[PDB]
Amino acid sequence: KVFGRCELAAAMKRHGLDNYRGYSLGNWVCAAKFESNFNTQATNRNTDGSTDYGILQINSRWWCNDGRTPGSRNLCNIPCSALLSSDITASVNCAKKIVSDGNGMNAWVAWRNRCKGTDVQAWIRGCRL
């Protein structure tokens, strides 16, 4: 599913991401824009041989199982394909663990490089939330 901007903002808010670990909703929408372009089916191979999955490009090296990432963990206890679903529940649950791991949203390099410190509230402008 390709979410609209406000559509994703509403789903993330319903699933408890607004202000999760102190990160406002716009931070999460911004991350998803630059990770996946709001496309739940997005997959991208990483240079280390792991793959990123879904709306927030969650990495098979630590977080989900894809069966082809040696020496990798599955800390969200989920097949990586479950992070591609139209329903974002598994991605959100997993993202909550990631953002709690010590470095906050810096876990998403694209968030650090493209969202961090910017006017992230712009990402929820006009949304009826």
Q: How far is the CB of 26 from Cl ion (least distance, A)?
A: 3
Considering only residues 27 to 66 of the shown chain, the ones binding Cl ion according to CB under 5 A are none
Selection from 102, 105, 117 nearest residue 23 by Cα: 105
Sheet (strand 51-53) strand order: 43-45, 51-53, 58-59
Selection from 22, 39, 45 nearest residue 86 by Cα: 39
Stretch that binds Cl ion, among 43-51, 75-83, 85-93, 101-109 (CB under 5 A): 85-93
The DSSP secondary-structure symbol of 102 reads: S
Catalytic entry in 35, 48, 66, 119: 35
- Binding pattern for the stretch 106-125 against Cl ion, x by CB under 5 A and - elsewhere: --------------xx----
Query: What is the residue whose two structure tokens read 């280390």?
Result: 48
- Binding pattern for the stretch 66-85 against Ni ion, x by CB under 5 A and - elsewhere: ---x--x-x-----------
35 is catalytic: yes
Residues at the annotated binding site? 101
